[PDB]
Structure formats: C-alpha cells, structure tokens
Design a binder for this molecule. Structure first.
Ligand SMILES: Nc1ncnc2c1ncn2[C@@H]1O[C@H](COP(=O)(O)OP(=O)(O)OP(=O)(O)O)[C@@H](O)[C@H]1O
Ligand SMILES: [Mg+2]
Lengths: 119, 239, 395, 234
C-alpha cells in the first residue's frame, strides 16, 4: 500500500524513508500519485535518470503543471471572470491611501492564481 | 332532449368520467376468466352471500348466446343493459349472417357501445367491465376483456373487479400449459385465483364453465366444494 | 473491557473538573437572560447607568418659530402626555422634523435624539435573515423563466450601470404563476439565496388581520421599512390570499381584504414613487387577482411556470436523482416520457418513492424497475389527488 | 364545469381540442415513413401483462387495399374514425369506380374532427373531440403518401412523422435518419431502430406492429416471421 505508506513516512519527515518508498514501488502510476502527494506536501526528491518516467515524475513533483490544472478547473467551474474589489465591498447595498492599499490587497486575494484582473 | 357533454377532456388529457367508471368497476366483485384448451371458465366472487337472497336472480355470469357468455364487474344495472343489448345484437347477427356470432364480434360491439356512451351528449359512461368467454365456429376458445372506456383485449386469463390486480398477478405466475392440460386443472386454477382474494372460501365462489359444442354450465355449490377440497388436499403434499 | 475502569475513573474526573471550572467561571442562570461572565463589563455598565440617562420615546408634532433662534417643538410622549420643549444643545435644529419619532429626557423633555420610525415587530420578522439552501441549479426546465426572473429581480441590483447608461428603467415587478408544485416558491427561494439586497418574504395569509385597517397598516409599514434600504426585494407568496379582485356582493364581502390589496397597489404604483423596491409575487390562482394588481407598473413581468416539457422533466429527474444511488442504466428520458403532464414535485416524489422501494427491499441501489414502480405509484395511483388538471384552468 | 366544449381560450385555442391533443402523449409511439418504394407504418403494442394476447392489440388498421392507418392515444376513439374512413372509402369506389386518394381519405376523416357540440347539435353528434392521432399511409396517383391527422382536424402530408408518447425523440431521430431517396427496407429498419430505443419493454416480434403499402402491392401487415427477419439485425 505505497500511497498510504508514503503519507505515513511524510508524517515521520524521514527523507530517507520517503526516497526508499518512492523508489521501492514498481508501478509507474502509483509513483505518479505519490509524486502528486509529495508535490502537494512541498517535499521534493532528486530522482535518478535511470528511473523510468523521470521527466513526468519530476514535473509532477515540481508542480509545474499546477497553474494549467488550476486554470482548467476554473474554466470548468466558469469563474474565470475577474472580480473587482467593488463586487466584494458591495457598497451599493450600504444604506484615501489606506483605502486604495486595502483595495489592492482585496484584488490580489480574490483573484489569486487566476492570471486575469480588470484592475 | 338533454344534450350536455358529460364526458369531456380534462386539461391533463384524460376523460375523467371514464376513469370514474373504471373506479366503479374497481369497486365491483372479482370476476376471473380463464381460457383453457377445450374449456373456458368464469368464476365470480359472490361478495356477501346472505341466506335470504335468491341466488338465482343475482348472477354476474350471463350467457349472451349459446356459444358466448360474459361475467361483469361494476354497476349491476348498467351491466344488465349491456347484456340485453349484446343479446339483441347476437340474435340480429345470427339472423343476418346465418352463423353464431364470434367472440370477437360481440366483444367489439360491446366495446363500441361503451365508447359511444363515452362520447355522446347527455350520457355517462357504462360503469361495468366485462369478461366475455366463448368458442368460435372453428372450436377455438376465446376470452376477451372490455373496460368502460371501450378498449378490449384478448387474454389467456384475466380478472376484473376489486381484487383484479392480485388475481392477475397470481394468474401471470400460475397460468401455464401444464395448468390447463385438463378441464379439472383449468377449473382448479380459476378457483385458486379466486381464493387468492375470497376470504371465506368456496361459499363465495360462483363458477360457470363452457365446453366446446356445449352450453354454459353453472357449477353447483357441492362441485365447487369438492374442487376446493381437492386444492386443499394438494396444498398439503406440496408442503 | 480492560480499560473500562480507567475509562470511568477519568470520565468522572472530567465531569468533576467541568463542574469545578463552571464554579469559578460562570455558566448559570440563563432564565433571566444573563450572558456568560466573560462578557461582563461591569465598570462600563455602571458608567453607562450613571452617565447615559434613559430617554422616553415621543413623537414631534409641530415646530413653532423654526426660522428664529428659539424654535419650540410640540412632542407627544406616547401614552404619557404632550409637551412643548426645545432641542438639546447637542442636536442640530435641522436634524428634527415634524412627525418623526424623537427621544427626550425625563426632566425637561428636551429632544435628545431623533429615532427610527416605529415598525411592527411582525413586519420586521418578515425580512429574510437566513437565505434558503436552493440555488438556480436546483430548478430544471425553467431556463427562460429563470432568465426572465433574474433579469428583473437580480440583474438590476447586481449591475445597475448597464441600465442607467442607456436611460433604461428595468421592470420592478414579477408575478410567478402556474399549477401547484411547478416551482414558483422554489424559484423565489433561489432568488433569496442568490440575492444580496434585503429580501422580505410576505405570505398573503399573514396580511389578514383581526381589526379593520390593520392589514393596510402592515402593508404600509412593510413598504416603509423596505424604503429604508438602498435596494430591496419583497416576496408575496400566495398573493391570492389578499390580491383577489374587488367585488360588491351587497354585504361587506371581503371589504377589508380589498382595502389591504388597494393599499398594496397604492404602494406599488401611486402618487408617491415606490422606490428601489422590486416586488415578487407567486400564486397558483392568477385568474382571481385584481386587474389593477395584474397591471404593468405593479406586476410588469408575468412569468408562467407551466408544467415541464419532456426535456424539462428529464432535467428535473436528473436534478432530483443526482445524489441517488441509482443503477447504471436508468432511462430517465423514458421516465420523463411516462409522466406527460407532471409537476416537478411529482418527479421529486417519484425519485423518493423509487428510493423507498429500493430501501424496503433491503437494497442499497435503486434499479430502473424501482423507478417504474415509483411512477406507477405516484403519477398513476395518486392521480386521483392530483392538483394539476383542476389548476391549469386557473393558469 | 362552467366551460362548454366549444370555448375559446384568450390565446385563441379551442380548449377541448388542446386537451384532446394532450391525450396523444399518453398513447403508444407510432412511426410512419414515406419513401419512393412505399409507406412503412410501425407502432408499439405496449403489452401490460404476459397473459394479454398481442394479436388482439390492433393499432395498424387496413383502411383499404391501398391505404392503412396507425393510431395513437385513445384507441377506442379511433374506431369511429377508422369506420368512417373505411365506409367513405368504397363509397368513392361505388360512385366513381376508383380508389380514393390518401389525401381525400384523410380530409374526410378530418371533417369528422371538430364536429362536436353541446347545444344546437344532432342527437348523434359527438360531445368531445377524438382523443386520437392518426397516421394514414397509402399509394395513389401521387405515389406513396403519408398523412398525419390530429384531434384538431388538421391533416398534413409528412415525409416521416412520429406520434405518441415518444413523438419528440422519435421525431428527432427521424429527422436525423430520414433522406428522401432511401429504400423501403431502410425505412422499416430505421423505424424499428427508433422504436426499439424508445420502448419501455424490449423489442421483439410480438410487442410491435409493422405494415407496408407499396406501389403495385397491397397493404401488408408483417407476420411474426417477417418481423423476426428484420428484428434479428436491430
Ligand atoms: N422546476 C423544478 N425543478 C426542480 N424541482 C422542482 C421544480 N418545480 C418543483 N420542484 C420540486 O417540487 C417542490 C414543489 O414546491 P414549490 O415550492 O416549488 O411549489 P409551488 O410552485 O410554490 O407550489 P404551490 O403553488 O402549491 O405553492 C419543490 O420544493 C421542488 O423540490
Ligand atoms: Mg408555493
């Protein structure tokens, strides 16, 4: 049960055990899923070029495809439209340097990792 | 003359008067018809059998002709009119064609009359469904069912009335070629189907058979009791 | 079982510890409305009790000599009395107007603070504070109806800039009508869930009151408190309770309800502008509504929630059977074909009864046969009690 | 209720006519196809019990030796229209020694629709529209011809028309699969394919009716063996 073993070793922060678990498995797909888990956890491994499917495994562990996957999700979840801080403030329902700085922070937070903004 | 459209289309697309007539049928006594090999059997649940009631007069199985007889379920008075009209037309067809009517012909006339009463001004639909059994001129047994709407179908075995659904479910399971090998087995199947709904037993079963080249024969209560005894005996050996 | 003795020992220790903690901290009373002691600012409470004097609520009646430097204000202190007072030094003269509620002191009754207008608590509770759990994704077969409803009740509030630029005045009223179970209140709940402005739900039966003129008073106060917001939505569910057409039957047949309906009509489109209120009414008997209520400017859009077609019924079946543990080959198109004129409620009941048939047989997955039996039980067997055939004559 | 049978809605609809049109959607699906090689009519029997005899469910009817009809909806209502079609035909033959046009038969049947009323009507006049939809298919001087009739009396020639419960999906499939120059065998196969995907039950040679009216040949109801021959493919 390689994926849960890798999770358990990550709970142990035993880098040697992470490497041993990753290179012990012979299944390429299981190694890809484990690479996804490692990339999410922020743990990276320097695989050997002799290891089969080194390229895609390294790309998965480096989260280089994270941006494209996130954008594909957002396109599927039809939320690609940028949001102005006014749509969050909703001042039309309410019966400065600091204000502008706060609004820039809101614009950054709301549209984080989307790549598009109206502002 | 009263000219009012009693039967009109509901906005849903239904003829509500026809459905109410079918409900009146569903409030009637269970009548079961089984088409065997050389016999056709009609068994009607007698509802409640009062000891002061002249059982001859209250009969839900009536012979339309020498080769055709039907058992109804629904409003008795409407059924009497339908039976009388069918008998008159049977005699007219015998006069014209010089041949006894086929089961299809009398069934079609009854259904057409019912449909006419579901589409005529001032007339409510007949509140009876009929099970018409008989033999054609070639000796083929035939069983047909007509409903207040005016649609008729041929059935190997069928049931109408309050217990129609359960009896039809039972007949779908026990109507086989083996079960209709002999006349006795066919009558036993009819009695079993009636016993699925009849509570007391053979006392509330009026059974009448018709054999090829023979007239309708009403089974006496002792015969039905003997058949029920046979079924009860056969029940034990299957346990 | 080996740990049971230690389990009970530590559990009793925990209970004793919790009681001991509650001994020092608080958590008691709760019948006299006492907050937990962690929120007790007792010094500030004493300072408020001393410095902050109580103020009796009165109503200003007339301002004498408003032009000069000595304006006298006639106030009507509720059931107490009537006085001629002057404003306190901390209130601007232009902040008090005739007919508005004020708050005055108990010694000289000088006006100390202008107050919001009085609103009936029953009217106040009519505004929605918890949005429903229904989105527009839960309404199937009503694409055009939902679009027409949204472009009146949601789009002008969300993006008003698209309307002011072209000199466009969007409709300010929508009447959802259709047979029962077709989704009028479902769409209203979806609107209330998606809306950001103040949403007020009014049931017509709530506008029926014991006394004469009280229903009109509730309508007036409802539109008064709806006008205290920049944008507002009022939902009138079952408007046929009070929206019936005016008639004269010799006696006083429905005179008071007709007066309530007339007050609602006057608020919708009368001498005074309505405001930014966008009303919304749902009824299964639109034929009974008054012609003046069914008029543009009061009910500008009339969205019909007719029974779903084949595609709409299939969409509703997909919506309600989404979380079902159905089989792999459920022919939902066939099921939609098997119930020609059926409301969405009947489709939901068909899904629920198919699940119930599967549960009764102790099965964790509902087959297509279960859905067929559900259609037979709901669409066919229950068709005697169907509200559809009678109610499409009314719509 | 308060409304009469001959009442107009504010939208200009005859109320009882629309309500009878709604009755067809509860009927069984029928599909008619007209091709240069002939007219193919198909219908689903919709057997509700193994005990019911399929042969008694007659939903495709010989109007005349060159004309057949497939009915959907209230089958009992269709009997009067069928009888009037079969009596009106052979009356044209009686007076003119020729078979009627399919269009003429459909028009004569259409004239029966809307002949209902409450007051100022004959004792034999009907009280409600015929809650049935008819598909006439025949061969005449204009070759093969298929006409669709609905309870409003509006009859119209159709290249390929599907009526009944699955009229929408079957019509969409017919539009997808119909081309003007195709054989009668292709028409039969396509109609059977469309029926098979819309039946509640499983398609076999017992729960469907197939008939063909070809030029030269007469109206022909497909037997069980002929049905199994074409069903064995799909
Ligand atoms: N178009 C629809 N799509 C999905 N579900 C629907 C639809 N219409 C009705 N339903 C379901 O049926 C239920 C019927 O309740 P609903 O509040 O929508 O009825 P209504 O139209 O307001 O009826 P009434 O006129 O009796 O007040 C809904 O709660 C919902 O679950
Ligand atoms: Mg509602």
């Amino acid at each position: 049960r390689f994926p849960e073993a890798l999770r358990l070793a990550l709970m142990l922060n035993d880098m040697e055990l992470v490497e041993d678990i990753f290179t012990s498995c012979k299944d390429v797909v299981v190694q890809k899923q484990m690479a996804f888990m490692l990339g999410r956890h922020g743990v990276f491994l320097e695989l050997s070029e002799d290891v089969e499917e080194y390229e895609d495994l390294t790309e998965i562990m480096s989260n280089v495809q994270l941006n494209s996957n996130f954008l594909a999700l957002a396109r599927e979840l039809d939320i690609m439209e940028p949001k102005v801080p006014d749509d969050i403030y909703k001042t039309h329902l309410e019966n400065s340097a600091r204000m502008n700085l706060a609004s820039s922070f809101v614009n950054g937070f709301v549209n984080a990792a989307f790549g598009q903004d109206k502002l | 003359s009263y000219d009012r459209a009693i039967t009109v289309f509901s906005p849903d697309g239904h003829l509500f008067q026809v459905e109410y007539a079918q409900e009146a049928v569903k409030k009637g006594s269970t009548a079961v018809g089984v088409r065997g090999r050389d016999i056709v059997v009609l068994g009607v649940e007698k509802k409640s059998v009062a000891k002061l009631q002249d059982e001859r007069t209250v009969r839900k199985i009536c012979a339309l002709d020498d080769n055709v007889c039907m058992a109804f379920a629904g409003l008795t008075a409407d059924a009497r009119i339908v039976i009388n009209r069918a008998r008159v037309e049977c005699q007219s067809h015998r006069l014209t064609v010089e041949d006894p009517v086929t089961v299809e012909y009398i069934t079609r006339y009854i259904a057409s009359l019912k449909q006419r009463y579901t589409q005529s001004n001032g007339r409510r639909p007949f509140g009876i469904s009929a099970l018409i059994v008989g033999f054609d001129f070639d000796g083929t047994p035939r069983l047909y069912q007509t409903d207040p709407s005016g649609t008729y179908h041929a059935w190997k075995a069928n049931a109408i009335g309050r217990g129609a659904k359960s009896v039809r479910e039972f007949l779908e399971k026990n109507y086989t070629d083996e079960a209709i090998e002999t006349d006795d087995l066919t009558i036993k199947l009819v009695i079993k189907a009636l016993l699925e709904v009849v509570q007391s037993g053979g006392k509330n079963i009026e059974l009448a058979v018709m054999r090829r080249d023979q007239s309708l024969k009403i089974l006496n209560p002792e015969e039905i009791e003997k058949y029920v005894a046979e079924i009860e005996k056969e029940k034990e050996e299957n346990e | 079982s080996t740990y049971s003795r230690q389990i009970k020992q530590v559990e009793d220790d925990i209970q004793q510890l919790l009681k001991k903690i509650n001994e020092l901290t608080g958590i008691k009373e709760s019948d006299t409305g006492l907050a937990p002691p962690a929120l007790w600012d007792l010094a500030a409470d004493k300072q408020t009790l001393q410095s902050e004097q109580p103020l009796q609520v009165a109503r200003c009646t007339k301002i004498i000599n408003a032009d000069s430097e000595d304006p006298k204000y006639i106030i009507n202190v509720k059931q107490f009395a009537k006085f001629v007072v002057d404003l306190s030094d901390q209130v601007a003269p232009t902040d008090i107007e005739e007919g508005m509620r004020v708050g005055v002191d108990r010694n000289k009754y000088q006006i100390h603070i202008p107050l919001p207008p009085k609103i009936d608590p029953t009217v106040t509770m009519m505004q929605v504070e918890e949005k429903p759990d229904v989105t527009y994704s839960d309404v199937g077969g009503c694409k055009e109806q939902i679009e027409k409803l949204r472009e009146v009740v949601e789009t002008p509030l969300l993006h008003p800039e698209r309307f002011v630029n072209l000199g466009i005045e969007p409709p300010k009223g929508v009447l959802l009508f259709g047979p029962p179970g077709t989704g009028k209140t479902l769409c209203a709940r979806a609107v209330a869930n998606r809306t950001d402005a103040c949403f007020i739900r009014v049931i017509g039966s709530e506008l029926v009151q014991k006394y004469v003129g009280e229903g009109a008073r509730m309508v007036r106060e409802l539109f008064e408190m709806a006008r205290t917001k920049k944008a507002c939505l009022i939902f009138f569910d079952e408007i046929d309770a009070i929206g019936g057409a005016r008639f004269d039957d010799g006696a006083g047949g429905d005179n008071e309800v007709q007066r309530t309906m007339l007050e609602l009509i006057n608020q919708l489109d009368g001498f005074d502008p309505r405001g930014n209120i966008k009303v919304l009414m749902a009824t299964n008997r639109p034929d009974t509504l008054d012609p003046a209520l069914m008029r543009p400017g009061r009910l500008d859009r009339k969205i019909e929630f007719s029974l779903p077609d084949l595609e709409g019924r299939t969409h509703i079946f997909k919506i309600h059977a989404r979380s079902m543990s159905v089989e792999r080959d459920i022919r939902f198109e066939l099921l939609a074909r098997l119930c020609p004129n059926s409301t969405g409620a009947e489709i939901r009941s068909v899904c629920t009864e198919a699940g119930m048939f599967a549960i009764r047989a102790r099965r964790k997955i509902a087959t297509e046969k279960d859905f067929l039996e559900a259609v037979n039980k709901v669409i066919k067997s229950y068709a005697k009690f169907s509200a559809t055939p009678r109610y499409m004559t009314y719509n | 209720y308060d409304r009469g049978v001959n009442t107009f809605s504010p939208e200009g609809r005859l109320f009882q006519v629309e309500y009878a049109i709604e009755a067809i959607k509860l009927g069984s699906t029928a599909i008619g196809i007209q091709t240069s090689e002939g007219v193919c009519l198909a219908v689903e029997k919709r057997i509700t019990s193994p005990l019911m005899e399929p042969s008694s469910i007659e939903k495709i009817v010989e109007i005349d030796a060159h004309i057949g009809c497939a009915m959907s909806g209230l089958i009992a209502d269709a009997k009067t229209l069928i009888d009037k079609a079969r009596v009106e035909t052979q009356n044209h033959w009686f007076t003119y020694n020729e078979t009627m046009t399919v269009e003429s038969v459909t028009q004569a049947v259409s004239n029966l629709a809307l002949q209902f009323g409450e007051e100022d009507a004959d004792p034999g006049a009907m009280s409600r529209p015929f809650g049935v939809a008819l598909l006439f298919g025949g061969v005449d001087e204009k070759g093969p011809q298929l006409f669709h009739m609905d309870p409003s009396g509006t009859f119209v020639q159709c290249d390929a028309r599907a009526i009944g419960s699955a009229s929408e999906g079957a019509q969409s499939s017919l539009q997808e699969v119909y081309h003007k120059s195709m054989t009668l065998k292709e028409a039969i196969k396509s109609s059977l394919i469309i029926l098979k995907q819309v039946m509640e039950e499983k398609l076999n040679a017992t729960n469907i009716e197939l008939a063909t009216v070809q030029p030269g040949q007469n109206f022909h109801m497909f037997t069980k063996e002929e049905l199994e021959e074409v069903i064995k493919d799909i």
